[PDB]
């Protein structure tokens, strides 16, 4: 068995990890995953490890 690490999660769902004129580096400080991508919504926010009883495959 084994967890899977996940920073993709709904915009509205997600959890605020900080303010937004945060920088790469202070998001990566602690360990929040960080994405600028979209607007209006918060980059810096924390990780969601969801549970996947089916392994997947991937590139190794």
């Given at each position: 068995e084994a967890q899977t690490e996940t920073c993709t999660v709904a915009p509205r769902e997600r959890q605020n990890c900080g303010f937004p004129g945060?920088?790469?580096?202070?998001?990566a400080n602690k360990g929040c995953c960080f994405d600028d991508t979209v607007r209006g919504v918060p980059w810096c926010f924390y990780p969601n490890t969801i549970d996947v009883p089916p392994e997947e495959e991937s590139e190794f």
């Open positions: 945060v920088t790469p580096s202070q998001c």
